[model samples]
Each structure stands twice: as C-alpha cells, then as structure tokens.
Target: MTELKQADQIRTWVQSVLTDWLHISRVADLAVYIGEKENADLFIVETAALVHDLIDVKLPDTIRLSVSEVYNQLVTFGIGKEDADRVIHIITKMSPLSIEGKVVQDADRLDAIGAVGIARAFMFAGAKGHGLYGDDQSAYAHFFHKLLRLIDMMNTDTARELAEERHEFMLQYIRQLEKDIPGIDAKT
Candidate 1:
C-alpha cells in the first residue's frame, strides 16, 4: 500500500475502535469552538478526542487497561515508543482531577452537556446496568459524580465560555425535574 493509503487505514482502524466511546459530534463542536478562539491545532485536538478513552480502567477488566498498559499496546501496533508516550501523556493527564487533564478534558466534558449529555449519562448508566436510583443512591449521584463538576472543571477559557450557558441549562433541568417530582428530594 502507498504511504497515504496505509495512513488512511490506520486512522480508520483507530476511529472504529474509539467511536463507541468518544462522542464524535460533541468533539467536533468543541473543536470548532476551540479552533475559533485559541487558534487551536485541529489535528492534535481532534486526535486527542479520538483516542482519549482508548484505554480506560473502568471499562471492564476484560478490555479495560490503564493508560500505561494501553501505551504498550500502541507500541506493539507499530507506533514508535516516543509517539506512544505522547499519546499516553495525553490520556494520563486528561482526568478531571488533574490540572494536566484540563484542555482535552474540557472538550470531553463540554460534550456531556445539553439534552444529549442527559440522555447519554442515563443511557451509559443503564448500559452498565447500574440502577438509576439504588437502595442508597439515585441517578442524581451519577450526575454529581462527573457531570455537574464538568462546568467548573473546564481547562480552557474557550471551553468555559461554551460551558456557562450549558451549565445553566443543566442546573435548570435538574431543578425543574425535582420540582416536577415532589417526593424526589426526599429519596435516599
């Protein structure tokens, strides 16, 4: 295969593996937002979004591997050690709890907003087969665990700008949902 054809094949393989985990539409929206303000490099930003979750510890031990483990796997796939390390760096640093995880993390987080985010959160939670409201918890706990904190956790100014309006909408949705369900507030 020509070098161009080979590159295309690799890109396609990577996308196929990642599509189910990384929400593409959300990533594209954030890319557009970031590209406008920071003069962001679309290639790097988009590639990061595509591969961020290539290895996740919480994704079931059968396939889920830590960032470092994933790095090793990447090396085995013909990616050089240096490039693999670079990818690993991005994945390791992109967690919400870390300052390094900010930029791409912000992009990922922004995707979790709006009606789509609400639907996705519940959908994924259900896919995990976790009860929305357990004996001691509710679906609201999932929201707080990651979704609510996302607005504040955003790393880039551009991301934060986009997040403000969405954040308000999320808060309003939660409040309105609660208002509609009078007894929900008292649930465990």
Candidate 2:
C-alpha cells in the first residue's frame, strides 16, 4: 500500500550506488515478481529484497546500516519487527535461504546477466572512464570471477533455468568482445 512508498525512496538512494543502473530497487521489484510467481510471501519478499543491499560490505562504506541496522531501517521504513527479522534471515545468505530469501537471491542474480548484465558490467567499468581492460577492474575479470558463476550459484531451479539462457547470451557477447578487443587495442 502507501507504506511501500519508502520502497521508492529507498530506490532513489540506492540509485546512487554502483551495483548497477537501478540495481537494488530493481532487484526488489524483480524479487517481488519472482516471489509471486513462486507463491512466496509477497510482502516479506519485497521487504527482504528492498533491504539487502543497504548493508552490503562490497558497497562503498558508511553503513550506519549493517544487518542489524537493516532492521532499524526497515522498521522505520514501514515494515514491522517480525518482517525485519525475516529480511535479516534472508540477507544472511545461509539462513542459506528461506523461500522468500531464495526468490530474492534469484532476482538479484538475474540482474547480473544477459543483456542488462553486460550493460551493467560495462557501465560500472566505463562509467568511471576506465578502458575495457583497466588496471585492476576488467569486465572480463568480473565475468570470470562473478557473473559467469552466477548460473551455478543460483539458489533455486527457477534461477538456474533462467540463468542458463542468460549465461548463453553473455557467452555469445563475450566471444564477440574477444574477437574485437585485439583489433581495437591494436588500432589505438
């Protein structure tokens, strides 16, 4: 309902984070849909989805919002204590997944592959004016170390199946990237 308004504002703050273009908010949106498709708790799933990244250690810094604080934020944002704990459990990763947690994981992983995944990868690298193969942060490095493995890491069958097609899409695109990179580098 209107309480979900905080979800949107959270998205606005998250929009500034580097997870991708609209990544955190979009994951919540995607997770809610995935949750419904799988018949999970829609509200809990959305609440869980919306809060996970607020405390991500890989994200920059200054998280007055760890998993515990995620509780504080969500409760303040409109969710209640019972729901916040569920969000905490889901984000904990081995709480390896409650059903709603699994759904959210699938959705978050979904955002990291296929067409948008590739775009997100490039944007994160290039948005800062880095070359395709910058000093330490190559897109291929991200692909190899993280994105490519997401298919195998999927917590649900729904995620694995969806990941397969996206995995293929990325492979095809990478093949082309490999083909062109040498020439692109050779030229300039």
Candidate 3:
C-alpha cells in the first residue's frame, strides 16, 4: 500500500484501539473532528490524536512502549519524513503555539471539562481508587487544579467558544456538589 494509505490504516486502527481498549472514544473523536473542522492536515492530526495518550504520565509502561513502536512503524509504513516529524512533534511537544498542535491540545483539553469532563474526572479517580472529595489530591480538586483553568488556556476561537459553555457547566455542577456535601466548600 502507498504511504498515505498506510497512514490512513494506522489512523483507523489507533481509533479502534483507543475506543475499545482504552475507553477514550471522546478524546479520539475530538482530535479528529476538531482537526477536520479546523482544516488541518488530516494525516498528521489523526495520527497524532490516536497516539496522543500514549505519552501521558498516567499510562502504563507497556502502553508507552507500544506507542513508541507504533510511531516507528509509521515511518516504516511509508509516511513522509515531514508528516512523520509533524506527528511526532505534536504528540511530544503538545504545545498551543502551532496551529496543528493547538487543535489537538484544545480537543484533548475540551474532553476534560463539562459533562464529559465531569464523567472522565470521576472515572479516572475511581480507577485510581481516589476518594470523591478532598484537598488538592482529590478528584473534585482536579476541577479547580486543571479543568476550571482550561478555558483560559484554549488556543483557538472555536475551542474557546466551546470551552465557555463547558466551564460554566462545571461551575454549576460544583456549586450543587458543595451544597450536597457539607464542609466541601472549605476545601476549595
């Protein structure tokens, strides 16, 4: 198959793996959809999006190694040097400076707020066996530490617009949560 065709196949495979095994379909979907919406290079955005989580500090060592191997495979599969570098750069740096990187970063951050963000935060906490509420370390604390701040960090106007609604939703949820749990207000 051509390099382009192989890259396309890799994108599909990575998306399937993320959805079925990693249970991060939302993140995967956001990366690709947002990239398309922004008119980014589809191959770079899609490939980077699929493997973005592999470099996360929270991921397992085995998965991280797999990510490295997959990146190498992309090169062997015939992806152009420039495209491969772009994919690697976006995934590794994850900065908001570049337009392409900004789209991916925004999509990932978008997944961390609002209704879906709320679900992900609790799910991540539960997976790690953390309590529902507490100080800086708690799942609830994550909203303040990261999720609440994402709106300001957004790089694109599209992401910024989407983030405003989600940010408000999280605030509303937090207010209700504090009302339900006595003394929780003091923690924040």
How do all models score by TM-score? 0.72, 0.77, 0.83
Instruction: Return the clash pairs for model 3, or none.
Output: none
Which lDDT tens digits does candidate 1 get at residues 1-188?
Answer: 34334334445755655535447546645764675576654444544555676575545555545676566555665656665565567777663333323556777777788666787777876776665553333456767666888787677788889888888888888888788877665565
Per-prediction backbone clash count = 2, 0, 0
Worst lDDT 10-window in candidate 3: 16-25
Over the stretch 1-188, how does candidate 3's per-residue lDDT look in tens digits?
A: 36467756776666554442343456656766777778877667666766677666666655543545657767777777788778777877862456777887888889889998899899988988886887667788888888899899887777888889999999999999988998995654
Q: What is the C-alpha RMSD of each candidate to the true structure, in Å?
A: 4.2, 4.1, 3.0
Best by lDDT: 3
Against the unseen true structure, what C-alpha lDDT does each candidate score?
A: 0.63, 0.74, 0.75
The C-alpha stretches of model 3 lying farther than 4 A from their native spots are: 1-8, 15-24, 66-68
lDDT of 3: 0.75
List residue ranges in candidate 1 displaced over 4 A: 1-11, 18-25, 61-84, 95-101, 133-136
Better of 2 and 3 by lDDT: 3
TM-score result, candidate 3: 0.83
C-alpha-based local distance difference test score of model 2: 0.74
